[PDB]
Structures are given as C-alpha cells and as structure tokens.
Amino acid sequence: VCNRLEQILVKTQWAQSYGEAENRAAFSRDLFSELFNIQGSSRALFSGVGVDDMNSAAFTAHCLRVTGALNRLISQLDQQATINADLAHLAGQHASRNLDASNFAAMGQAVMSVVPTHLDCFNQHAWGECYERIASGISG
C-alpha cells in the first residue's frame, strides 16, 4: 500500500496534473467544485473562505492552500517519518472542524475526478492506496 514504487508513480503524475502558476489555480478550483458536486453538504464547511464566489481571491487562496498542502504531502511521500509528522500537524488543525470520514471520502473522489483529466496516463489503484495514506493521517 503506497510502497516506494507507487510513491514515485503518484509523485510523477501529480506533477504534470497539478502544473504551475495559474494552472494550479484552475486545478484547485476544479477540485473543490467537484468536491461540492459530489457532496453538496461540504460547501457549507467553507463559509469562512468566500465560497459564495468560487472565483474570488478568498476562496481561490483557500483552494491553493489545500492543494499546496497536498503538494507538500505528495513531495514527502518517500520520506515516511517526515510526512507522518506533517500529517500529524494537519490532523490537529482539522480536528475541530467537525468533519467525518465521508468528507475525506468525497475529497478523494474529487481528487480521482480532477487529476486524471489533466493527464494522458493515470493509475487509480496506486492513487487510491496513496490517498488513503494521506487521508487517514489527516482524518486521525
């Protein structure tokens, strides 16, 4: 489950899918847009970050922080003790936000929804295991 081989695969495909500059901004907005279309109750959780207008800077800044947190978590996939400490940090931040396992289940299905549409090659099996790695560390 998300072994040394699969981490390389996932880190690679996340790179070209995430992109650079504003391609990260449209990517990040597509992720939460698909998150809401998969779970409508999730949209209210982001009332503090300008979810009224998903193109607003307030909400785009939140999306880039979440995808950027994903970006740094993907980077340290091959450093087990480093991502464990970072997942432990993120877990304490989400602990008071009244989230359940389906919220992280809707997020992953949004990740599986958006990421491959910017790719020619995608391995959902490796992405499923490696996401469960991150989600279980953040969910608790």
Partner 1 sequence: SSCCSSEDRANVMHNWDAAWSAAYSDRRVALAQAVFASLFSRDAAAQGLFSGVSADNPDSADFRAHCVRVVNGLDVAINMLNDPAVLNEQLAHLSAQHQARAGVAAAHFDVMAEAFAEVMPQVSSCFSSDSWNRCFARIANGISAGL
Partner 2 sequence: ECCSRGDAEVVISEWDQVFNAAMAGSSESAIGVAIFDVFFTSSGVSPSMFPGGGDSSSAEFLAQVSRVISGADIAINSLTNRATCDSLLSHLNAQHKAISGVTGAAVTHLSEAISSVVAQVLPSAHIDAWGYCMAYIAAGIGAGL
Contact mark string toward partner 1, 24..53, x via CB under 8 A: ---------x--xxx-x-----------xx
Site for partner 1 in 57-116 (CB under 8 A): 78
C-alpha to C-alpha distance for 83 and 120, rounded to whole angstroms:
28
Residue 93 near which of its own copies, partner 1, partner 2, none (CB within 5-8 Å, type-dependent): none
Stretch that binds ligand HEM, among 5-13, 94-102, 113-121, 122-130 (CB under 6 A): 94-102
Residue 130 assigned as binding residue: no
Residue 117 near which of partner 1, its own copies, ligand HEM, none (CB within 5-8 Å, type-dependent): its own copies
**Residue keyed to tokens 């800044």:** 61
Q: Which residues contact 64 (CB under 8 A, 6 or more apart)?
A: 24, 25, 28
Q: Which residues contact 11 (CB under 8 A, 6 or more apart)?
A: 74, 75, 77, 78
Residue 94 assigned as binding residue: yes
